[PDB]
Amino acid sequence: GETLGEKWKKKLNQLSRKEFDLYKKSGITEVDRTEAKEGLKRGETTHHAVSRGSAKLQWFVERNMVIPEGRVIDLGCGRGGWSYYCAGLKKVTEVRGYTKGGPGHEEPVPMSTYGWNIVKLMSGKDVFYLPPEKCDTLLCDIGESSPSPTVEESRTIRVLKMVEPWLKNNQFCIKVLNPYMPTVIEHLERLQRKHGGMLVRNPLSRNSTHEMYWISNGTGNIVSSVNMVSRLLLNRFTMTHRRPTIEKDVDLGAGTRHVNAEPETPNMDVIGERIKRIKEEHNSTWHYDDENPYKTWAYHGSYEVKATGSASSMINGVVKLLTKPWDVVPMVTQMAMTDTTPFGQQRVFKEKVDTRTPRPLPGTRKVMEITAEWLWRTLGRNKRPRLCTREEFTKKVRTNYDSAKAAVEDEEFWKLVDRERELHKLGKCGSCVYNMMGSRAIWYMWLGVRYLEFEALGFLNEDHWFSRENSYSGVEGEGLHKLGYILRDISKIPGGAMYADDTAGWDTRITEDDLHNEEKIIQQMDPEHRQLANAIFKLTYQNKVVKVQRPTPTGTVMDIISRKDQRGSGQVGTYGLNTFTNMEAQLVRQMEGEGVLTKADLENPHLLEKKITQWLETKGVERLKRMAISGDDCVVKPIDDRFANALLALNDMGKVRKDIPQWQPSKGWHDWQQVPFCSHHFHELIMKDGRKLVVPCRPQDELIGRARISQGAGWSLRETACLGKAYAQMWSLMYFHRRDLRLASNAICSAVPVHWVPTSRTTWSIHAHHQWMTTEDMLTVWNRVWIEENPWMEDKTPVTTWENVPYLGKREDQWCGSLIGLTSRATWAQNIPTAIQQVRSLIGNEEFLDYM
Amino acid sequence: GETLGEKWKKKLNQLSRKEFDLYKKSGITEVDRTEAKEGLKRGETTHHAVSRGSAKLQWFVERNMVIPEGRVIDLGCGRGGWSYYCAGLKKVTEVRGYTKGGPGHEEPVPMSTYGWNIVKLMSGKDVFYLPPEKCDTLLCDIGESSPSPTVEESRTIRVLKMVEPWLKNNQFCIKVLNPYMPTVIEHLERLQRKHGGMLVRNPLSRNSTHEMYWISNGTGNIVSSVNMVSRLLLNRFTMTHRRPTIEKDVDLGAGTRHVNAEPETPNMDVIGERIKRIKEEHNSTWHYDDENPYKTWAYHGSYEVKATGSASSMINGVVKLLTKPWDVVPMVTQMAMTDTTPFGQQRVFKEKVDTRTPRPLPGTRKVMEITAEWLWRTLGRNKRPRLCTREEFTKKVRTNYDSAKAAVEDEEFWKLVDRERELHKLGKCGSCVYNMMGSRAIWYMWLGVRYLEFEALGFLNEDHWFSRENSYSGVEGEGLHKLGYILRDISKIPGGAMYADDTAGWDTRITEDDLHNEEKIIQQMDPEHRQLANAIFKLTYQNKVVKVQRPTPTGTVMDIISRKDQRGSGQVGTYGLNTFTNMEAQLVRQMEGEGVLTKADLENPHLLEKKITQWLETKGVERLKRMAISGDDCVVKPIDDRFANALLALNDMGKVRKDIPQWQPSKGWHDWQQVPFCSHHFHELIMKDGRKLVVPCRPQDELIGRARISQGAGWSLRETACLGKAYAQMWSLMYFHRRDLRLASNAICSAVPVHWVPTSRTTWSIHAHHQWMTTEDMLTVWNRVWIEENPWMEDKTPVTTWENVPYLGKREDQWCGSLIGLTSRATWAQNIPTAIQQVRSLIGNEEFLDYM
Ligand SMILES: Nc1nc2c(ncn2[C@@H]2O[C@H](COP(=O)(O)OP(=O)(O)OP(=O)(O)O)[C@@H](O)[C@H]2O)c(=O)[nH]1
Ligand SMILES: Nc1nc2c(ncn2[C@@H]2O[C@H](COP(=O)(O)OP(=O)(O)OP(=O)(O)O)[C@@H](O)[C@H]2O)c(=O)[nH]1
Ligand SMILES: Nc1ncnc2c1ncn2[C@@H]1O[C@H](CSCC[C@H](N)C(=O)O)[C@@H](O)[C@H]1O
Ligand SMILES: Nc1ncnc2c1ncn2[C@@H]1O[C@H](CSCC[C@H](N)C(=O)O)[C@@H](O)[C@H]1O
Ligand SMILES: [Mg+2]
Ligand SMILES: [Mg+2]
Ligand SMILES: [Mg+2]
Ligand SMILES: [Mg+2]
Ligand SMILES: [Zn+2]
Ligand SMILES: [Zn+2]
Ligand SMILES: [Zn+2]
Ligand SMILES: [Zn+2]
């Protein structure tokens, strides 16, 4: 009675080498380690998982199969993948790793990922020589494979006997190398009867091993689950080969972890009513989950929900046909491995949102205070804040998931809005919640929340408070086709290089002090407006209640959480307030670069404001004109390059830069064409006419890949073609200078009917003016944008033909991702009208023209 | 009358391209930019000169041709080479750089070199469009070459007219592109009559340009100096080609400069008498130079002296013959471009010694205080401090520039010693001075100073206070052949990796607090010993008076300077006290890694000692055994790898690591054979006998190059051969495992007489026990060292033949610099006895044997 596992093993060994290489990865889940390995080789110590182990453990922890807590002990820690992951978990307070080390064995790798200060990895530690210790969590990942089952059998038994005395009513996750051998089966059943738990297969395990993990949190039949894996591994022999499901690797953050500074203290007076109403509306499945993972957000309860969100995306057919050589390239397809599974949201939340920014120094808070007041007064020198209305909100909803067009039309919606507004006037909030993305009550509430925000704070956008004219540094309403010109104008200002540092997760870096300073605009409001805005700032912006989905072993739930600081990203006015605070922060950094702000000043509990006020009143506006600031994105050209080393205030404010050590000097550009801004850089093109154009540009694969993703999860063909045409129109207006794009532009537009009007939206950017969704000829639209209404184009004489509309320099094209070098492109370039003919065959018999 | 410069220009253009490439560098001075360019390309912002310009300006400043001070303005600053150099000069308070920038023009490069916080480099600044400003120093390096003299003529005149209004009784250094054209000559004479100054040729200028510099500090004939350059450039056409004199590039340090924190405040009560006696002994040339460059050392006066010190070295003939393929390699010859010119000392002093360490935090001082007291008590648990004597000092001088053998024999020397000692007992110091390396008064004083230091503090070395047995962490008296074994033993201790961070200029990082803590050993001394040691610590160690040479336009002078902290490197007890403080510092870092010491503790003005005392009394010794510490060099194997990120205390103590950003985590090893220690790493070699040897090793070129440098600046041939034989004996005893060395070992020893005994010293290291300077057979000496008296060699049965004395693994040999791969080595390998025959022909007819 040679078991199924032994058959699988016998078949596994009887394989060809390439028949083996095929099978061992067929259909499994696998993390992309490319960035990590490249980062690790350059000696980086932050963010990176030290091995594939971090991701492997994540899978168990995600599903609460093991919940690391208290003192964690990690046997055979190796490089430390499991240990570093545990360091950032809510209830973990200490991690001890033991591993053998020496020749032929992995060695602990020092890192500075989040919680490193509670991780103690020791090499030279053979666990089979170690006396058991007290711990709340026991991890073990030891097990060396062997082509002989009985060899693995003895190795597995050895592990189990070593590891058993470590177990005592505590969490555990233990690797069982060979679980199908009958003697091992017998030992596990004895183990399960004493310590509980169950065997689980990890999808990240290759098919070349039958390994499973004995986890503490679960029950079930050991013999059953083992054969279930055996069967699966057997079927994966005969079945057709499936390349691995590629998964994004883990981000473990950076810096020391102070556990006692993590927990959130909610203002229950403010957010209480909101929780109660949610609780009442979902009373039948409402519960309080003590196993929630939230370290930094206050948890108030959960209710059950249906599982939403796929871990993939759905591809636009028409444009995938006409861009055939890009099925070859990774990035265009890598953009389609989006993950909005409830697991994916939870991973993003932990790694990006579940953090706390240390309170800025008293001197730093003073500078921000002074600068903010000065900035708001400057921004309101001409304009006044005003209330927006139902009428106004309705029009914008009409013109621009939208049954919102029906909601704003339903009178009962506005009745609810009125009801909630009267609460705000009394200092109460009843239903203002947002999501990390019931009937229509849930929908009306949410849309009513956004209206009240729009009503009180919408003027910032609607009245263009951050236009360049009104804000000096702003670019609101300008458009992607003008941004390049603005950067060119900035480069003409004498001083240092042009700097463009990205903040790591800007919205999560907004402090309580930032919120306090953004709030000061209410001082310029009329009384009734003021109390409404004051309600929005205090009740919903400084006390946020959030809905977030979370997978559980028993099903998906919706968690109700709260947080005082950070930016509510799903809230109206995010862009303006981000622009405001960023403007302030970049002024503060400029003061530091110029020596007006010193380290002593940041620490000084009673900083003198005469110096700051003086600097702002004499140089404030001039310094604002040195900047281009769009939300969290910024370009700064300081008066000299001391700015590069000005890091004290920037870091203390909490606006830590992305992808660079906290205290490493910044690096800028003097060639304004190499400067990144709003996901673009900008090139200067001299036309044959002699006149100059400044055009937006970005990596081509980013443009190709975004277009091979259609809207509507279940789209037809009349829409998918119309979406593809919209991208084509965009490409011919904004990226006409890219050879592949303009050619692929003339491919889509001739493979889609002329009576068809481009539907849906290309991308959602505030800089997108969408001039490419129109009635009209693409050359006539082009002339209007780039010549006629372009203020940086002196001579206005139109362009009659498409080839005095220039391309990029050819080498410049290739450098930005053009494929015109490869022969695969030139071949794609002759299969042109065949590919056209192929899609127009799918669509049917309508209006086709031909585009060269 | 076409001038000499115009002839030179006419000849320069009429040259072949390779006849030009030859001439343009023939005989000029040139800085090695290789490290800088490689560093700059990796984005490093410290230490590196941004261009060759820093070195070029240095040449002028060195010779006081221009003395940058106050507000410095730098026209055509370019990358900023001149500006960054000025930032670290004594009297400079602000540096403003203006440069054009844009296409075809150099751009300012942001750096973090010392004084960056007073450097304001602005691009987009055309100086021919700029109104003149007030400044104390005007620098200008503008001038574009042209094959046409008259073109250069107009460009030069343009510069002169632009630059003249900037001049007003201030320092200046202005590039004069073409100085030989008659009209330019005429303009310069007019300029010189108004603003003074003179023209100077810079040796770093290529011969392809006639450029000179109008500097403010000097007078002389413009027409004369121009033709002097013309003549020189003309002669360099016909003369035989000389490859450039290669010079070491500039080191501009790192960090912010706080000018007001730089000046030294001398204790004139303590050091006054010493200055007075020096002043009296050199009263005829004694003066007070206000133009001294010392920012951080107190200056007290100068006297004139003869110029000492060459900028090159003198090569050992015998071993250069027998290592012919290494004339090809750079590093062996690069080791001979030593520079002990008075310029070189001044460059080293400015860049390395003329710095100030910020006072450590109060909490940090407490930890050091507690740890030091605990450490001294541990070190004195068995031994007592004792006085050393005249007899003892004499013997060591007899057995070991030494007319010191005559001085200790002269009774009048000891009379002076007694006289100075009686002052010390009264709390006075009269003649205790040392040097940065008159009659014999100067010599007796100095040697008498070192005796009194030896008398009071010599016990630390003479009684082996830092032997491994007595200090746990120490390696004094162990020997280079045992160090490797000690590291192997340390690797057996479980925990983190083995760390080996080098301190940048350890002796200059010794704080007043370090000195205070090292002083505590006097508490264990007898009264008479105590007052003598107390005199040494307080009068000469904590108040140092130093003699240093400095070049001036009029001649070399000797400056008398002083400093309270830092280690007197030319003083007795340096090694022991460095070992002590390093032991302490590495314990303090281990406390931080283990969490015993926190950031709050460092800042806490009244830190609690119960925690530290507890840690030391229970774990202190165990942690000491995790370390190998020899002076400023250390190897630490912490209990885990949190140590790598433990940087707070280390930096705050002032012991900043070398060649790594101040806050970047350290990187260690687990392979103990890759760990650097005492200029070596150590390999484990299994003999054919089966027994294992652990041997010292280092880059081979470092060993080759050190041996191709003889002692005695004017050596004969009987000594140079004897020095070469000493190296050969060393190589066969310590580096027998290196194939080239053991072969070159058997080459030197057979090319040098057997009746000749190896003279002089190989290298000066305390770990060198010099077993290679002996009467005896090299195999019998080898057996004694590696087998018989080796405690890590259990079986003691001797080795009869030289080829069970193993080599390194062959790939391991090549990796450490072996040349056995190249065919140039294999050819060197057959010209063996010819090369032997060649030297034995120089020596004469004596005892030659032959060595295989
Ligand atoms: N038929 C066949 N079986 C193999 C081969 N290599 C390994 N195996 C079997 O697969 C089992 C586990 O494979 P591992 O070698 O541990 O893992 P892997 O998939 O080869 O990946 P790596 O070990 O990282 O190279 C072994 O116990 C072998 O029985 C092979 O080349 N051919
Ligand atoms: N005969 C000859 N003269 C040259 C050549 N190149 C430059 N010169 C002369 O040398 C003068 C200065 O040389 P530069 O070109 O400024 O400097 P360089 O030595 O060539 O070094 P780089 O400019 O960095 O390439 C010019 O004004 C020319 O008159 C050449 O190739 N042949
Ligand atoms: N007897 C033993 N004692 C301690 N560690 C051992 C051991 N035998 C093997 N090991 C180590 O156990 C490790 C298993 S791989 C562990 C990977 C780790 N969980 C991570 O996420 O990175 C190997 O590196 C191996 O060196
Ligand atoms: N009209 C002008 N105004 C300002 N700078 C100019 C200029 N014309 C040329 N320059 C700049 O002057 C520089 C001379 S090379 C200067 C090197 C600099 N002293 C250093 O040590 O690094 C060039 O980089 C050139 O770009
Ligand atoms: Mg394999
Ligand atoms: Mg950006
Ligand atoms: Mg040249
Ligand atoms: Mg070292
Ligand atoms: Zn509300
Ligand atoms: Zn581009
Ligand atoms: Zn003295
Ligand atoms: Zn070596």
Author numbering:
A (entry chain A), B (entry chain A): 6 to 405, 418 to 454, 469 to 883
Q: Could you pull the original sentences from the published paper?
A:
The C-terminal domain (residues 273–900) of NS5 contains the RNA-dependent RNA polymerase (RdRp) that synthesizes the anti-genome and progeny genome.
GTP is stabilized by base stacking with the aromatic ring of F25 and electrostatic interactions with residues L17, N18, and L20 of the MTase domain. The MTase domain is located above the fingers subdomain of the RdRp, such that the GTP binding pocket, the K61D146K180E216 catalytic tetrad and the SAH binding pockets of the MTase domain are positioned away from the inter-domain interface. In this conformation, the tunnels of the RdRp domain that permit the entry of NTPs and RNA template remain accessible. The network of interactions stabilizing the interface mainly comprises charged residues. Two Zinc ions bound to the RdRp domain are also observed. Although the overall molecular shape of NS5 from DENV3 is similar to the NS5 protein from JEV, the relative orientation between their MTase and RdRp domains differs markedly between the two structures.
